[PDB]
Enzyme design. Structure first.
Site, PDB file in Angstrom:
ATOM      1  N   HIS A 165       0.841  -1.209   0.000  1.00 28.80           N
ATOM      2  CA  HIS A 165       0.000   0.000   0.000  1.00 28.80           C
ATOM      3  C   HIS A 165       0.868   1.248   0.000  1.00 28.80           C
ATOM      4  O   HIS A 165       1.786   1.350   0.794  1.00 28.80           O
ATOM      5  CB  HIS A 165      -0.870   0.025   1.243  1.00 28.80           C
ATOM      6  CG  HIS A 165      -1.748  -1.169   1.399  1.00 28.80           C
ATOM      7  ND1 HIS A 165      -3.112  -1.114   1.215  1.00 28.80           N
ATOM      8  CD2 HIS A 165      -1.475  -2.427   1.818  1.00 28.80           C
ATOM      9  CE1 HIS A 165      -3.643  -2.287   1.520  1.00 28.80           C
ATOM     10  NE2 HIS A 165      -2.673  -3.105   1.888  1.00 28.80           N
ATOM     11  N   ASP A 188       0.166   4.295   1.019  1.00 33.49           N
ATOM     12  CA  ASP A 188       0.025   4.976   2.307  1.00 33.49           C
ATOM     13  C   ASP A 188       0.619   4.203   3.485  1.00 33.49           C
ATOM     14  O   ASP A 188       0.580   4.673   4.623  1.00 33.49           O
ATOM     15  CB  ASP A 188      -1.431   5.366   2.594  1.00 33.49           C
ATOM     16  CG  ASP A 188      -2.422   4.223   2.393  1.00 33.49           C
ATOM     17  OD1 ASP A 188      -1.990   3.069   2.160  1.00 33.49           O
ATOM     18  OD2 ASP A 188      -3.643   4.500   2.439  1.00 33.49           O
ATOM     19  N   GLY A 215      -9.244  -3.087   3.924  1.00 39.05           N
ATOM     20  CA  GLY A 215      -9.925  -2.644   5.122  1.00 39.05           C
ATOM     21  C   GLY A 215     -10.103  -3.666   6.203  1.00 39.05           C
ATOM     22  O   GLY A 215      -9.422  -4.681   6.206  1.00 39.05           O
ATOM     23  N   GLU A 253      -7.087 -13.450   5.614  1.00 41.47           N
ATOM     24  CA  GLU A 253      -5.913 -13.206   6.441  1.00 41.47           C
ATOM     25  C   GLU A 253      -6.360 -13.497   7.862  1.00 41.47           C
ATOM     26  O   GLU A 253      -5.728 -14.238   8.606  1.00 41.47           O
ATOM     27  CB  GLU A 253      -5.488 -11.763   6.339  1.00 41.47           C
ATOM     28  CG  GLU A 253      -4.629 -11.321   7.499  1.00 41.47           C
ATOM     29  CD  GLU A 253      -4.040  -9.950   7.293  1.00 41.47           C
ATOM     30  OE1 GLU A 253      -4.726  -9.050   6.706  1.00 41.47           O
ATOM     31  OE2 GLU A 253      -2.867  -9.798   7.689  1.00 41.47           O
ATOM     32  N   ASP A 305       2.831  -3.336   4.031  1.00 44.85           N
ATOM     33  CA  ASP A 305       2.908  -1.976   4.635  1.00 44.85           C
ATOM     34  C   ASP A 305       4.297  -1.891   5.306  1.00 44.85           C
ATOM     35  O   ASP A 305       4.415  -1.936   6.533  1.00 44.85           O
ATOM     36  CB  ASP A 305       1.842  -1.780   5.732  1.00 44.85           C
ATOM     37  CG  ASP A 305       0.412  -1.758   5.203  1.00 44.85           C
ATOM     38  OD1 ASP A 305      -0.006  -0.728   4.644  1.00 44.85           O
ATOM     39  OD2 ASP A 305      -0.324  -2.751   5.403  1.00 44.85           O
TER      40      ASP A 305
END
Ligand SMILES: OC[C@H]1O[C@@H](n2c[nH+]c3cncnc32)[C@H](O)[C@@H]1O
Ligand SMILES: [Zn+2]
Length: 349
Positions: free
Chosen positions: A14, A16, A181, A214, A293
């Protein structure tokens, strides 16, 4: 001593979640927005994770810095450019970066994220800004980069716009749609807006990937595959709990975007039990190794390779194999896909 000192392909990370503490610090001060710390080291210990959290707990780390980037054109473009640079250094020749255009806008988004004040950075504008930063970086570092736009599980009203954004910026870096999300929001895979966005992606030829399995059960993966129609599964570790589903996805050659380190840190994996990626390796499944991430896990792509090398006993033979599958499973058009494959086989020689 890198675990795999050769060209790599990354399909799951990602934007961000791959920002430099330094750039976060720069815009915090520049805009006068508060951060939980004022030193890259302490900022990195607050944002970063040392021990396993839960998916909702880990997801909160974004609250600390997203406000610093969101709404700023210069920042949005900059993090995009610096992302390419980071990946270039890790020895990645092709990457697909993902992010939510809505969580970075400050205009024409409801609900307004991060308590921002109306501005002019529209969701469409953030896509364009990331494109520009991505392209500038490609020219400058020489790696190929493409993007994936995320739908947020808790916000299905945003979904059809994400689809429209994918249609508009088709191949203008944009290659697919994702559903990211909070996986634990019961029935989130089935909200009408998400379902309708995916039905539309199918009819309009827009590629699809879905975070699933996950933390959820095989059923969440089953919904992603059967109802949503993903071409790939983000994570998918719990699929093996349903031998029937697992074996069927194995037959269809479903690609699992694996993120080893992440699975441990999000609490998604009990280090006492054999990691799902081991089953995948043994079964010769279609999967890739991803960072997900890097900022939050205080990691690098090598973190994940080293982890599978040390424990799980992966070899260079497997590292080359899984990277060929990642190239075969990318959302690059056929001709670009051939070129990528050519490149890897040459360098793997
Ligand atoms: O990158 C787009 C969004 O995906 C969400 N995301 C990031 N890492 C994740 C792991 N698992 C699920 N969702 C994630 C974040 O909320 C981030 O704002
Ligand atoms: Zn992810």
């Amino acid at each position: 001593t890198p675990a795999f000192n050769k060209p790599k392909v990354e399909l799951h990370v990602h934007l961000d979640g791959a920002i430099k503490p330094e750039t976060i610090l720069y815009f915090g001060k520049k805009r006068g927005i508060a951060l939980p710390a004022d030193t890259v080291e302490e900022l990195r210990n607050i944002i970063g994770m040392d021990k396993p959290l839960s998916l909702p707990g880990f997801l909160a780390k974004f609250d600390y810095y997203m406000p610093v980037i969101a709404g700023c054109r210069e920042a949005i473009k900059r993090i995009a450019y610096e992302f390419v640079e980071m990946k270039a250094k890790e020895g990645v020749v092709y990457v697909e970066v993902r992010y939510s255009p809505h969580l970075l806008a400050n205009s024409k988004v409801d609900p307004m994220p991060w308590n921002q004040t109306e501005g002019d950075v529209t969701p469409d504008d953030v896509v364009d800004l990331v494109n520009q930063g991505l392209q500038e970086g490609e020219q400058a570092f020489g790696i190929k980069v493409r993007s994936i736009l995320c739908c947020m599980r808790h916000q299905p009203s945003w979904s059809l716009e994400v689809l429209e954004l994918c249609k508009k910026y088709n191949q203008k870096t944009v290659v697919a749609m994702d559903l990211a999300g909070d996986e634990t929001i019961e029935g989130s895979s089935l909200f009408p807006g998400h379902v309708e966005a995916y039905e539309g992606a199918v009819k309009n030829g827009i590629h699809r990937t879905v975070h699933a399995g996950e933390v959820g059960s095989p059923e969440v993966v089953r919904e992603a595959v059967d109802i949503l129609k993903t071409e790939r599964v983000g994570h998918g570790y719990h699929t093996i709990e349903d031998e029937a589903l697992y074996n069927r996805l194995l037959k269809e050659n479903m690609h699992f975007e694996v993120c080893p380190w992440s699975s441990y840190l999000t609490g998604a994996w009990d280090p006492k039990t054999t990691h799902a990626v081991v089953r995948f390796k043994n079964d010769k499944a279609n999967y890739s190794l991803n960072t997900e991430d890097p900022l939050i896990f205080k990691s690098t792509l090598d973190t994940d390779y080293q982890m599978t090398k040390k424990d799980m006993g992966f070899t260079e033979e497997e590292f080359k194999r899984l990277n060929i599958n990642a190239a075969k499973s990318s959302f690059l058009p056929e001709e670009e896909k051939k070129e990528l494959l050519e490149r890897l086989y040459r360098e793997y020689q």
